[PDB]
Design a protein around this ligand. Structure first.
Ligand SMILES: *[C@@H]1O[C@H](CO)[C@@H](O)[C@H](O)[C@H]1NC(C)=O
Ligand SMILES: *[C@@H]1O[C@H](CO)[C@@H](O)[C@H](O)[C@H]1NC(C)=O
Length: 534
């Protein structure tokens, strides 16, 4: 059985899985229960000496997503969403969930000094666990290419438990507990990964969906100061679908509104101090109260109930303003998207069939947008069913007359043109961007949000060349191009550059292209980015 002795001298045992060795379920913070609820995580004080860490612990508490998709998707599309599992609640779950997991090449030991890939999971900041993202395909591929890596994944608090907001959270200085969980997991790696064979100065953080939005928050955290004990906590970042979070400050209208609603639902509506009251209620009361605020696949969709918000302390301002003001870590980044990011989210508003209904849906999801702004938005993404997402499928996939334009707006603001805005203002390091069209022709969803998880962790396809091989090459060497792929990946300087600046994936292989599509959407959306915050 593998062993490792932590920085403090505790010797722990892990698991020999033949194709790798796993140290699963190590606690890194005190259980955030009772009056530690919603507060910053506290370092685990306690001995792990003599203990065995052979299985994943429970995930943190999950919010029910509230989707209807399983009755509107064709069997082919549905089979693939079932597989990524990013839109499902994980089980088992517990408030005592803050554990970290280290998975390494067989025969690895202290002094091997391998690059470390730190994975951050993320379904809508409301669901997810580390147990649903198998490290074995990434590790087996790293060994095969002679660039072995260690895979570390960290649990963090999602939903009310991890991202409650409003005036009282703000006053107490407890905003964005979930991101602080991740950050403390990063410090733990800085202080203990050398004992497992890793090199703390070679950490690349990567994630997909809310986990990718998290990597962006970590680049902007403390105005871009990512150092811990005179060293950087990470040297590179990979963002699979997700850039800045389009959100109002922690004490803005919706953060407050969801707080009041949750406190009433938990039976704290008449408390003078609602946080004290919420730390008093039972785990079941808190879970039920949370499940009475909207889940991300409900009609509110990406007007998310729980998500990272600027607090003036650790995320000091509006994340678009921080990016154009240069307040970020200076690291090399890979950031990319699936071609049809918003189609899965489009299944939430399938009762919107007319333009007037569409106008009301945009006006209620974006409360800061003026009519003029909503008018420009609907001109940039017209009703014309050939111009929506799944992109370039003509008259196909139009579940409703508005499904494809709502899907185009959600995909772009949430993920695809938010990446372009970052790439056009980030000068912190070399930029590499990709866009996948691997699943072209898949009915209703196209190359949908989270399909990369299947080809990164379960199956091999043209996309695995980027999701495994290029990402291991980037983690090791800080250049994707050492993977030795058939196509050379172009460095991205800006969307207006001459020449191909995007690595692209189709059903058969890789090729390059340009990030110059839907410029009208990009100007409707990002001329004044606050107008479309939630
Ligand atoms: C948040 O910001 C303050 C400085 O404003 C700092 O003292 C604190 O440690 C930061 N928290 C984290 C988790 O980095
Ligand atoms: C669609 O359904 C939601 C509830 O699921 C409702 O609140 C909303 O107003 C409906 N919109 C239209 C245009 O029917």
């Amino acid at each position: 059985a593998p062993t490792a002795t932590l920085a403090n001298g505790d010797t722990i045992t892990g698991l020999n899985a033949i194709i790798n060795e796993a140290f699963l379920g190590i606690p890194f913070a005190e259980p955030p229960v009772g009056n530690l609820r919603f507060k910053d995580p506290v370092p685990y004080s306690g001995s792990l000496d003599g203990q065995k860490f052979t299985s994943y612990g429970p995930s943190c508490m999950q919010q029910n997503p509230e989707g209807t998709y399983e009755e509107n998707l064709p069997k082919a599309a549905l089979d693939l969403v079932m597989q990524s599992k990013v839109f499902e609640a994980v089980s088992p779950s517990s408030e005592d969930c803050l554990t970290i997991n280290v998975v390494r090449p067989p025969g690895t030991k202290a002094g091997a000094n391998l690059p470390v890939m730190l994975w951050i999971f993320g379904g809508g900041f409301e669901v997810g666990g580390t147990s649903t993202f198998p490290p074995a395909q990434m590790i087996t591929k790293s060994i095969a290419m002679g660039k072995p890596i260690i895979h570390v994944s960290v649990n963090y608090r999602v939903s009310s438990w991890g991202f409650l907001a409003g005036d009282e959270i703000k006053a107490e200085g407890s905003a964005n507990a979930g991101l602080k969980d991740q950050r403390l997991g990063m410090q733990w790696v800085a202080d203990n990964i050398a004992a497992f064979g890793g090199d703390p100065t070679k950490v690349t953080i990567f994630g997909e969906s809310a986990g990718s939005m998290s990597v962006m928050c970590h680049i902007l955290w403390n105005d871009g100061d990512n150092t811990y004990k005179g060293k950087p906590l990470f040297r590179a970042g990979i963002m699979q679908s997700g850039a800045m979070v389009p959100s109002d400050a922690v004490d803005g209208i919706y953060g407050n509104e969801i707080f009041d609603l949750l406190a009433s639902n938990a039976g704290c509506g008449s408390a003078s101090d609602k946080l004290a009251c919420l730390r008093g209620v039972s785990s079941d009361t808190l879970e039920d109260a949370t499940n009475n605020t909207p889940g991300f696949l409900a009609y509110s969709s990406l007007r998310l109930s729980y998500l990272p918000r600027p607090d003036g302390v650790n995320i000091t301002d509006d994340m678009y303003a921080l990016v154009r003001e240069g307040k970020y870590a200076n690291i090399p980044v890979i950031i990319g998207d699936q071609n049809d990011e918003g189609t899965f989210f489009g299944t939430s508003s399938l009762n919107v069939t007319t333009d007037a209904q569409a106008r009301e849906y945009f006006k209620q999801s974006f409360v800061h947008a003026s009519d003029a702004e909503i008018d420009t938005l609907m001109t940039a993404y017209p009703g014309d069913i050939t111009q929506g997402s799944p992109f370039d499928t003509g008259i196909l996939n139009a579940l409703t007359p508005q499904f494809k334009r709502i899907s185009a707006v959600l995909g772009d603001l949430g993920f695809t043109l938010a990446r372009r805005y970052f790439l056009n203002h980030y000068t912190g390091g070399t930029k590499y961007s990709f866009l996948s069209k691997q699943l072209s022709g898949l009915p209703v969803l196209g190359t949908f949000h989270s399909n990369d998880i299947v080809f990164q962790d379960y199956l091999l396809g043209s996309g695995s060349l980027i999701y495994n091989n290029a990402f291991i090459a980037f983690a090791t060497d800080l250049d994707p191009n050492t993977a030795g792929l058939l196509v050379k990946w172009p460095e991205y300087t800006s969307s207006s550059q001459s020449g191909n600046n995007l690595m692209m994936i189709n059903a058969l292989g890789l090729y390059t292209g340009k990030d110059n599509f839907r410029t009208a959407g990009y100007d409707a959306l990002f001329s004044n980015p606050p107008s479309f915050f939630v």
